[PDB]
């Protein structure tokens, strides 16, 4: 059957402040493209390194893979394609290698060029699987 991975989502780092003068409030929504299931966790009030020690316990059956997606709330809220942070992807074969490696730096970009590049964080994750 699936096997449980559990991305742990320690912290961001260089949270674009977007606007200027202005603050994002980080938090992390998790995404199954083959189970449907979400996870998130707690937004962080006008912070530029944030921090949830959260981490989501996500299923893997054969050639399954998981995205853990940070969005900006405040901008979420601001509605027209505003609210994006940085979305970290990781495949079948990287969520082995990673679930025990227990560390991973997946930098908080854009989805890809012209697709709203307002994007400069990072995050740090680890990756273990659940006994």
Known sequence: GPVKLRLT????????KKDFFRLPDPFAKVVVDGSGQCHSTDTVKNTLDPKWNQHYDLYIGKSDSVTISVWNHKKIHKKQGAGFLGCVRLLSNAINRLKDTGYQRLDLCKL????????????????????
Request: some cysteine.
């Open 9 to 16: 989502v320690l912290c961001a780092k260089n949270l674009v």
């Open 112 to 131: 890809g060029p012209n697709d709203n590049d307002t994007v400069r964080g990072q995050i740090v994750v680890s990756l273990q699987s659940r006994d």
